[PDB]
Amino acid sequence: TTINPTNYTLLKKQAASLIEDEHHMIAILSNMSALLNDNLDQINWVGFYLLEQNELILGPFQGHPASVHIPIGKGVCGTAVSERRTQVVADVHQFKGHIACDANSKSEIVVPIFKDDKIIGVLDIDAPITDRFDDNDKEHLEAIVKIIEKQLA
Amino acid sequence: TTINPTNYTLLKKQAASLIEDEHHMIAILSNMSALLNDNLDQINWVGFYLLEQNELILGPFQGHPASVHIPIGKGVCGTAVSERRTQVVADVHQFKGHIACDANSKSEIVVPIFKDDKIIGVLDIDAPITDRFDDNDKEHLEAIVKIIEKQLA
Ligand SMILES: C[S@](=O)CC[C@H](N)C(=O)O
Ligand SMILES: C[S@](=O)CC[C@H](N)C(=O)O
């Protein structure tokens, strides 16, 4: 029950190695969601939403089925895009309503992905506990999106 | 050693219902790999590969990271496209070579996905035991593919 630490150092190394020479977005996203899922303890969902036709639409991910459409400025994902900055949410509950979405997502973090400064999607990770993600997770997770951005650039 | 029965009757209802009113391929493929994963015991990988520029390129899936490219006519997946027919392998080992790919994959099932007479990809499922998929599994799984093909149609 004790969150066993994640060696982000190795993670960024495993990530870069993993998508080297690949430029196809979906493949990269798919393998990355799996990679993150294999090296992040105490979480229940890790994936990507893509910005298409002025909204977020579900991309590759590891976990149970999820909502396909997320309007901009709505939710943690929609908020990361409307403000184009990472969203680290310690308590997903007091964030917007407390409806049927109060499953195993107590805390959460969303990192926007950019290509030539424009938002092309976001990285979304859920956790069954509160305060799962902090400044440190933020830094490192943003380094990962950067490794991803390099292959899509 | 045993395989817990899978309620394909229900699964097909949740499937059709899960992707009702959706037409975005990646969203559908992603949520579908999740559904399959939550409803199939004794398997270690479930996902899709997309037919692009004369080859299969990794798509949404649930499991550990997988190889990105698979040329047509190659492996279990490439053969399903080159022959455009479902491929069921009772013992993946005796198939092709027994290299570093003999991991948790003992048996496998691949089902080509068609759109207006052409193949757009394949559903692929690995199992940690041999003979995981019998004629019954295949038919209902092909049924699942049909539900997906209806949405991509
Ligand atoms: C975007 S909304 O604020 C949360 C989405 C959810 N974490 C998911 O797994 O899709
Ligand atoms: C052609 S190959 O042997 C297909 C892909 C492999 N089952 C996988 O699980 O990714």
Rounded Cα distance, A23 and A31, in Å: 12
| Locus of tokens 């998508």 | A19
Distance from CA of A52 to the nearest CA of B (A): 10
Amino acid residing at B43: I
Give the domain ranges of chain B: 1-153
Closest CA to A75 of A124, A134, A120: A124
Inform me whether the C-beta atom of residue B119 falls under 8 Å from chain A C-beta atoms.
Answer: no
Report resolution (Å) to 1 decimal.
2.3
Q: Is the beta carbon of A92 within 6 A of some atom in ligand 1?
A: no
Would you give the DSSP letter of residue B64? S
Q: What is the 3-state secondary structure of chain A?
A: CCCCCCCHHHHHHHHHHHHCCCCCHHHHHHHHHHHHHHCCCCCCEEEEEEECCCCEEEEEEEECCCCCEECCCCHHHHHHHHCCCCEEECCCCCCCCCCCCCCCCCEEEEEEEEECCEEEEEEEEEECCCCCCCHHHHHHHHHHHHHHHHHHC
Query: Which residues make Cβ contacts (< 8 Å) with residue A17, sequence separation at least 6?
Result: none
| B59 Cα–ligand 1 center, Å | 21
CB atoms under 10 Å from CB of B117, counted, come to 5
DSSP string, B33-63: HHHHHHT-SS-SEEEEEEE-SSEEEEEEEES
Chain-centroid distance, C-alpha B2: 21
- Nearest chain A residue to B38, by CA: A64
Instruction: Tell which CATH classification among 2.60.40.1260, 3.30.450.40, 1.20.210.10, 3.40.640.10 matches the domain B1-153.
Output: 3.30.450.40
Task: Tell me how crowded residue B23 is: count the other CB atoms within 10 A of its CB.
Answer: 10
**How far, in Å, is the centroid of ligand 2 from the Cα of B124?**
7
A67 lines ligand 1 (CB under 6 A): yes
Q: What is the DSSP letter of B68?
A: S
Range 122-141 of B in CB contact (< 8 A) with A: none
Helix (H, G, I), strand (E, B) or coil at B108: strand
**Rounded Cα–Cα distance for residues B2 and B100 (Å):** 26
